[PDB]
């Protein structure tokens, strides 16, 4: 009962009877489970079509981009520090994966990261650059975020880390279901703190909708190499591919354009439909 | 027959002569915590008859100009008796709900209400300049609920923000189109067909038990699909009655006093 054929349409003759499949009551909330043999004179037909491609695991098989993060390796003579970059891990900033995940309220999925790295020069050439090495460190919540490119926390005492050499195949790593609850909550109709009559207003306040302020931890990427004589800048694209996904409560898909992490909508853009006519095919 | 129905919960009983068959949302009747799923180790309080009874909220008035109404559970029951007191005294709790909506009209009236049960019914804020800014005082309005509005209007005065919801009706308050809201557990009160609707809602959450004061599990939205009109604006009342089912509380502590002035 996984990839097997859909049920065959039985042959039906003309009818004149008290049985009335055509009439229903949507007020009951049930949907009238009719087949075409109930109201029209169908022939017999063995059906070969399946439903394999519409499964949940098939639906989320495609990987999606979530972040485009920038690092550089500044020219040695210039004053400015080397830009390492630091990203709060979330799916809610790219519209496609957010819209697909927001079809359902609660989900569990294993999570397969994939990192694609592309580099480019930014100056009149003045000396080439060797093949750079990139360190991608996973920083779980509460761990010390780096302050400098050569900070002590890059020493990788307990954090997981990936070292990627340019020109190789894109690096891939899998993380299990890391959520503290029994499922992820895409929506949270609540607050982190309750304001109380004893506490001051400044202490009791909380964001609406935000279940937690650091859900899944932090990624940090740096260029391992020293200051090259000429500037090289690179961008890292992170791709999310859910595995073993189970989803639990269906929802209407988002119609209006997104705005921020919450379910809020921007002024003016609240017009999803377009003009047509009731009596025009 | 099937149009007649009697619901008995605790000392309360509801008898209706023109009911549709009741909806058990997501095919699951409410149940207590199984031993294989219980996370806390302290002994749970199961108050049963002291909380599993029908409480009636405020009665809204339906007019030609009315756009719709919404409520949050268990927030709307926070003033209702021993269930509200147990909510305020315990850290963790869970319950199912039987939601019963009564709206009676003559055979000469016409109109249709959609009663929608929404898990995690988040709503959009007024502030186009600051997301997620709605305060706890405005987000949890209690028994009187809140009203959908036909058009969006942000507060211009950033010097003293309103910090309230601005739910657009056809966008279902969350940016999803109204015609797709029927994927939620629902029943339609059509005034020619049935005078009441009954939804039995199981406890659905990502956790086995949760802090009821912080988190609202279900939302109930009543939206007029077809407007009420009658040969003349007419006004007919809608009464909403909720009874907890299989309520279970854990973690007794001192009473919380939420700031709601």
């Amino acid at each position: 009962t996984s990839r097997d054929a859909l049920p065959n349409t039985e042959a039906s003759g003309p009818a004149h009877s008290k049985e009335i499949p055509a009439l229903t009551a949507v007020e009951t909330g049930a949907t009238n489970p009719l087949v075409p043999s109930d109201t029209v004179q169908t022939r017999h037909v063995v059906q070969h079509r399946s439903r394999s491609e519409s499964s949940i695991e098939s639906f989320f098989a495609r990987g999606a981009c979530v972040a485009i993060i920038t690092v550089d390796n500044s020219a040695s003579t210039k004053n400015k520090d080397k830009l390492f970059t630091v990203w709060k891990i979330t799916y809610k900033d790219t519209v496609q994966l957010r819209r697909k995940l927001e079809f359902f309220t609660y989900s569990r999925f294993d999570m397969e990261f994939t990192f694609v790295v592309t580099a480019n020069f930014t100056e009149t050439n003045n000396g080439h650059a060797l093949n750079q090495v990139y360190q991608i460190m996973y920083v779980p919540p509460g761990a010390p975020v780096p302050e400098k490119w050569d900070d002590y926390t890059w020493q990788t005492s307990s954090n997981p880390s990936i070292f990627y050499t340019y020109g190789t195949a894109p690096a891939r790593i899998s993380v299990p279901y890391v959520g503290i609850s029994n499922a992820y909550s895409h929506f949270y109709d609540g607050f982190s703190k309750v304001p109380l009559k004893d506490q001051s207003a400044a202490l009791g306040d909380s964001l609406y909708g935000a279940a937690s302020l650091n859900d899944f931890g932090i990624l940090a990427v740096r260029v391992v190499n020293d200051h090259n004589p000429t500037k090289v800048t690179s961008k890292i694209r992170v791709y999310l591919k859910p595995k073993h996904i189970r989803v639990w409560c269906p929802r209407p898909p988002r119609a209006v354009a997104y705005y921020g992490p919450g379910v809020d909508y921007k002024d003016g853009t609240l017009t999803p439909l377009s003009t047509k006519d009731l009596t025009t095919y | 027959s099937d149009r007649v129905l009697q619901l008995t919960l605790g000392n309360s009983t509801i008898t209706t002569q023109e009911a549709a068959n009741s909806v058990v949302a997501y095919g699951r009747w409410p149940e207590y915590l199984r031993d294989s799923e219980a996370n806390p180790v302290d002994q749970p309080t199961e108050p049963d008859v002291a909380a599993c009874r029908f409480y009636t909220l405020d009665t809204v008035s339906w007019t030609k100009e009315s756009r719709g109404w919404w409520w949050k559970l268990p927030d709307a029951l926070r003033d209702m008796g021993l269930f509200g007191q147990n909510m305020y005294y315990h850290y963790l709790g869970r319950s199912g709900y039987t939601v019963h909506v009564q709206c009676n009209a003559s055979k000469f009236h016409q109109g249709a209400l959609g009663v929608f049960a929404v898990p995690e019914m988040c709503l959009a804020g007024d502030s186009n300049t600051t997301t997620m800014h709605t305060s706890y005082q405005n987000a949890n309005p209690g028994e009187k609920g809140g009203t959908f509005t036909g058009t969006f209007t942000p507060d211009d005065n950033q010097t003293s923000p309103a910090r309230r919801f601005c739910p657009v009706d056809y966008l279902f308050g969350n940016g999803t189109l109204l015609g797709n809201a029927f994927v939620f557990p629902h029943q339609i009160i059509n005034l020619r067909t049935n005078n009441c609707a009954t939804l039995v809602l199981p406890y659905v959450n990502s956790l086995s038990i949760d802090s009821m004061v912080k988190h609202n599990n279900w939302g109930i939205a009543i939206l007029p699909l077809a407007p009420l009109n009658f040969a003349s604006s007419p006004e007919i009342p809608i009464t909403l009655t909720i009874a907890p089912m299989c309520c279970e509380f854990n973690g007794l502590r001192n009473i919380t006093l939420p700031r709601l002035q």
Partner: antibody
Amino acid sequence: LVQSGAELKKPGASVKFSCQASGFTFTTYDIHWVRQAPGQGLEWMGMISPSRDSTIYAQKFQGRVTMTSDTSTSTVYMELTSLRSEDTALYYCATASRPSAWVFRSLYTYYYMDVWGTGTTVTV
Amino acid sequence: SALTQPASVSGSPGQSITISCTGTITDIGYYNYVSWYQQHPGKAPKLIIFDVTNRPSGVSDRFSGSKSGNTASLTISGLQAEDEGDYYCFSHRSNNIRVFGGGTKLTVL
């Protein structure tokens, strides 16, 4: 180095501001305006982004302040359309070029203001 | 509107002294784009701490910063006479609005 405009004194009527910068900083980075009244502390006025010509104005300033750019001279301009006596202040033009490590949204980088002009006192 | 700061802080040289910036649930409490600025009298402002705990070059190590909840604090350990001047908090409102602090005057006794 960023060059600020002249200092003006006429009351009530509109006053125009000028801010000239080097081409690399003009094309690559955003430009901010900050007002400094005597002893009152810094107050943010708005942002010009000549890489895309988008502008954002503060809510205290939106009814009075307009901003424009000139790519030929690598110069941006700000005009206060109406001025109260409160508006008598020192005004600063600043270019943001210090990048934050934290990724803004998931697709952009954040720049703090780090290069400041000489500024202009304006009297009403 | 503006971020809250104490009006004035005073102390002798050699002390360890902190100046605190308290905002709403937005600004410091959600966005880590919290920065501090310094202004000697008559001078243009100069950045001292750009990310929450990170110093630019040319700023001495006696300046330090920290974040806790809706509040971020700038701590100067071993206060010196040249540090006397204005100090300004700066952060980001939740959707593309920038907000300064009220400022603090530090007097070295």
